[PDB]
Design a protein around this ligand. Structure first.
Ligand SMILES: OC[C@H]1NC[C@H](O)[C@@H](O)[C@@H]1O
Length: 558
């Protein structure tokens, strides 16, 4: 166990575009983040991870980068960015930025040159291939719909894009590409950035000769794209030439990587990355083939995945833990119950388990308020290119009826987490003086930061209390994680232990009162915190009477 600031820190993720607008154009910006640092400090946040802040045409809201060395026009200036770093440092907060180097915008200078001719010096910065029998090079599908190969009539070849056609993949097999990327990383790291979150880090290495995927592989192509023969060689080379020269925290977004293989990216002995962003938990109820469709899940599955993720990190790796983010539905809607009667208690319950995992917790903007999914009705209400791609592939082809599709994407769309942050009860929830780029959830009159910061029993203040408790108790960061019963579908209970310091965490996932007798002669010394409960717990109790959605943290005897 090696203590590190990034294992003990409580991170907060800010999606700039939807956090706080300060110029009235309806788009959140860097000055807006700066304006709200005192709010985040009050919450108790130690580090902020911001989504892409670089010059971009926004086909994928920042993840299609046109110029890596320029600030996104809508977000502000380089001076604004340096000020954010300064203002955060003054508050002992650290900044983590998003590194998107699997692909660039098709407007990026490198691609503009690459596509201009087969002999351009930059041709090999991307993947260009001839048609196979007048068709795409192979059957690779794109995550955002259709083929991962886009035809360019000028040079009579197709280029590879795992994501949007406007996101051509960089050729990491070209040493010149790697060297230019490392130089770019240094440009940002030398500005004082404390962390890097690597976007789709496991797909940098492409499969030699691009052979077709089998019928089976097509059902989970994401996993096939993480099987490049040089991925670890490249991540480790990046560590040796760049990462190891700074005291930074690096997170790896390893979507598609089988859990068993994830440790190769985060085992500290391997000199690759630091913090694992696994997706086994957050996608537990998602179809792996029709990635927009959801299915029913049970608490036993949820906790069994957590146990597997914990065991996989083991002694040498380290995990992040989050229940939502900008690519997934809101935590309270997904894992809790967002109906008016249960939103606040279930949100507090999820906050309790989040802040007490043996992992670095990441709180997504607005979930500290209990923000919920957005009430989408028609397909034209979505901004997300991913849902549009699924719509084209599944509904426009007649494979799935529009109503069944909408029933599912209302619950799974990334856009559920991209509606503007709900600051107060004023027009557009105080997010902007103009017209928001994406509509504000009508529930902002009931759910907003101003209403909650001064109410001691608010969701915001429950997160604040839990963050302080985590900061105060080492066992809640480093303690061994033990699930008391992986097969229990009603009461989630586990202990966090560091020597003689042992804590119990309990969450009643059912909307009925539950009695829960502790196992193995465990008994309670004292309550640390609890939520949605008026029941009295006393010294030596070994049985808890749990109200619906009740959660709590207890110090155990011995
Ligand atoms: O860059 C492609 C994809 N990578 C993962 C990011 O979280 C998501 O927002 C983005 O669209």
């Amino acid at each position: 166990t090696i203590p590190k600031w990034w294992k003990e820190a409580v991170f907060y993720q800010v999606y700039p575009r939807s956090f706080k607008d300060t110029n009235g154009d309806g788009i959140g910006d860097i000055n807006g983040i700066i304006e709200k640092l005192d709010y985040l400090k009050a919450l108790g946040i130690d580090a902020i991870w911001i989504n892409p802040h670089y010059d971009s045409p926004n086909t994928d809201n920042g993840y299609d980068i046109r110029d890596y060395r320029k600030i996104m026009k809508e977000y502000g200036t380089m001076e604004d960015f340096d000020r954010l770093i300064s203002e955060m440092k003054k508050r002992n907060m650290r900044l983590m930025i998003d590194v998107v180097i699997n692909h660039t915008s098709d407007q990026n200078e490198w691609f503009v040159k690459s596509k201009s001719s087969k002999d351009n010096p930059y041709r090999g910065y991307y993947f260009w291939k001839d048609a196979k029998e007048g068709q795409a090079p192979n059957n690779y599908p794109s995550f955002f719909g259709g083929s991962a190969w886009q035809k360019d009539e000028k040079t009579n070849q197709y280029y590879l894009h795992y994501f949007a056609k406007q996101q051509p993949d960089l050729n990491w097999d070209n040493p010149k590409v790697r060297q230019d990327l490392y130089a770019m990383l240094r440009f940002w790291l030398d500005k004082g950035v404390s962390g890097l979150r690597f976007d789709t880090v496991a797909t940098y290495s492409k499969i030699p000769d691009f052979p077709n995927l089998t019928q089976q592989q097509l059902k989970n192509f994401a996993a096939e794209y993480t099987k490049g023969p040089n991925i670890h060689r490249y991540v480790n080379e990046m560590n040796k030439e760049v990462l190891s020269h700074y005291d930074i925290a690096t997170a790896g977004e390893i979507f598609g990587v089988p859990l068993d293989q994830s440790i190769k990216f985060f085992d500290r002995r391997r000199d690759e990355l630091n913090i694992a962003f696994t997706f086994d938990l957050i996608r537990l109820d998602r179809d792996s083939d029709q990635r927009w469709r959801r299915k029913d899940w049970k608490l036993s599955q949820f906790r069994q995945i957590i146990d597997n993720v914990d065991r996989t990190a083991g002694e040498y790796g380290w995990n992040a833990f989050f229940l939502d983010n900008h690519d997934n539905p809101r935590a309270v809607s997904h894992f809790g119950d967002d109906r008016p009667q249960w939103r606040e208690p279930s949100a507090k319950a999820l906050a309790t388990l989040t802040l007490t995992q043996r992992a670095t917790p990441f709180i997504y903007q607005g979930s500290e308020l209990g923000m919920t999914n957005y009430p989408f009705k028609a397909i034209d209400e979505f901004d997300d290119i991913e849902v549009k791609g699924f719509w084209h592939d599944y509904v426009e082809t007649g494979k799935v009826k529009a109503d069944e599709f909408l029933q599912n994407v209302r619950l799974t769309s990334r856009d559920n987490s991209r509606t503007p942050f709900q600051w107060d009860g004023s027009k557009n929830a105080g997010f902007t003086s103009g017209k928001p780029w994406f509509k504000v959830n009508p529930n902002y009159q009931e759910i907003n930061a101003v209403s909650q910061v001064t109410q001691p029993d608010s969701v915001f203040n429950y997160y604040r209390q839990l963050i302080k408790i985590r900061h105060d108790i080492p066992a809640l960061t480093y303690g061994t994680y033990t699930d008391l019963d992986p097969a229990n579908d009603s009461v989630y209970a586990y202990t966090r232990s560091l020597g003689a310091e042992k804590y119990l965490v309990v969450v009643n996932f059912k909307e009925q009162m539950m009695r829960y007798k502790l196992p193995d002669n465990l008994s309670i010394e004292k309550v640390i915190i609890d939520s949605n409960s008026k029941n009295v717990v006393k010294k030596n109790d070994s049985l808890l009477e749990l109200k619906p959605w009740q959660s709590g943290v207890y110090k155990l005897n011995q």
